[PDB]
Amino acid sequence: LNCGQVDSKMKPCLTYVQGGPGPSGECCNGVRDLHNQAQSSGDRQTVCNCLKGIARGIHNLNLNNAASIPSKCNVNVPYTISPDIDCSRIY
């Protein structure tokens, strides 16, 4: 999934993880799309590395916001918009 997408999608929610008046539902949804489009470790990797990339290239990512997204979005998974994910294997 062409990285820039990931970022261009995550970006408003990123505002949320740093201190945004989010999320608007959009995240949960767009997120699932990347989680539905990406299926096995290999597609996810590129994307995770990019979403992570931004998590890293933010100010003070607030763990909650991030974990929260799968937690409330209901995307039953190991990763959630962070700098330190299991992007590695994802299994």
Ligand X SMILES: CCCCCCCCCCCCCCCC(=O)O
Contacts with ligand X by CB under 6 A lie at 10, 13-14, 16-17, 27, 31, 34-35, 38, 44, 47-48, 51, 65-66, 69-70, 79-81, 90
Least Cβ distance, residue 29 to ligand X (angstroms): 10
Residue 11: CB atoms within 10 A of its CB come to 11
Asked if 41 and 91 touch (Cβ cutoff 8 Å), the reply is yes
Task: Please say whether the beta carbons of 13 and 27 come within 8 A.
Answer: yes
Determine the Cα–Cα distance for residues 63 and 15; give it in Å rounded to an integer.
13
Residue 47 or 59 having the CB closest to ligand X:
47
Q: List the chain gaps (C–N > 2.5 A) by preceding residue.
A: none
- What is the smallest separation between the CB atom of 44 and ligand X, expressed in angstroms? 4
Q: Least separation, in Å, of the C-beta of 4 and ligand X?
A: 13
Q: Which is closer to ligand X, CB of 35 or CB of 63?
A: 35
Query: Which residue in the shown chain puts its C-beta closest to ligand X?
Result: 13
